[PDB]
Amino acid sequence: PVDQPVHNYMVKRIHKRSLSAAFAIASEALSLLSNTYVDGTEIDSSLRI
Amino acid sequence: VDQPVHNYMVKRIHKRSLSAAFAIASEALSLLSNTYVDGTEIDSSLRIR
Secondary structure: OOOOOOOOOOOOOOOOOOOOOOOOOOOHHHHOOOOOOOOOOOOOHHHHO | OOOOOOOOOOOOOOOOOOOOOOOOOHHHHHOOOOOOOOOOOOOOHHHHO
């Protein structure tokens, strides 16, 4: 019987699954982010070490 | 949630002993002393042995 030069095109649906990645600690930031080029003159050696 | 990444667990040390002797008799250290009393034909050869 009948048989044709046939074709196949295409219409759609697709998925996804919400994020981040980890660690979490305390208040260093400001806790000594108050300085930055005057105060703290002498001896925080091992501090920045 | 669990709670942060960032500790560095702590540990341990020994001490004590490990012993070993070598016992030299009394009879043994005077014919191990000189006073230059020796040099005198009954100390040098059996000295070697």
